[PDB]
Structure 1
């Protein structure tokens, strides 16, 4: 009879909130969400949710694909790596396991 909505909001994680090319969007990585804001008006233009599920797993790091923009490498505590693209949501449902005891950092 009752129903529970999806998690919204969240804590802004300690990974550096990254800029886009041409300085117009700021991509901020929360825990269980990564969302991109338009800077001139301070408004989220996208919110790409990220499912987390194993009790304490967190988004370890994140960055732009330095080969091609509009791609994010995101890496969680257990070894799952996402290759998503902001301005859309292509890649949330398809992570990739790295087969690790525990991931501590990453850098592209």
Structure 2
């Protein structure tokens, strides 16, 4: 009878909120979410939800791919790395593990 909606909102993680190329979008990575806002009107253009599930695994880092823009690299505390692309959502359901003990940081 009762149903539960998928979680929205989120707490902004301490990973740096990255600017897009040509400074028009801002990519803010929450816990369990990464969403792109526009700089001009301050309305969000996409919300890429991220399944986190193992009690405390957190999004460890996130950065634009320096080879090609409009990609990301999002990495958890356990071994998991996503290569999603903002303005779309291709890459959420296909992560790649890394065989860590616990992933403390990553930089691209």
With the shorter chain as reference, the TM-score category is: over 0.9
Using structure 1 for the length normalisation, give the TM-score.
0.99
5+ residue gaps, structure 2, are none
Shift of 1:56: 0.3
Per the alignment, in what secondary structure is the counterpart of residue 47 of structure 1?
strand
Aligned residue-pair number: 108
Greater fraction strand: 1
**1:48, CA displacement in angstroms?**
0.1
Paired with 2:106 and 2:100, the residues of 1 have a C-alpha distance of 13
Distance 2:80 2:86 in 1: 18
Q: What CA deviation, in whole Å up to 9, does each residue of 1:42-82 have, x standing for no partner? A: 01100000000100010000000000000000000101000
Matches within 5 A, 1:72-83: 72-83=72-83
Tell me the residue number matched to 1:67: 67
- The root-mean-square deviation of aligned C-alpha atoms, in Å, is 0.3
The offset of 1:16, in angstroms, is: 0.3
Equivalence for 1:7:
7
TM-score (norm 2): 0.99
CA distance in 2, matches of 1:13, 1:77: 13
Distance in 1 (CA, whole Å) between partners of 2:40 and 2:24 is: 7
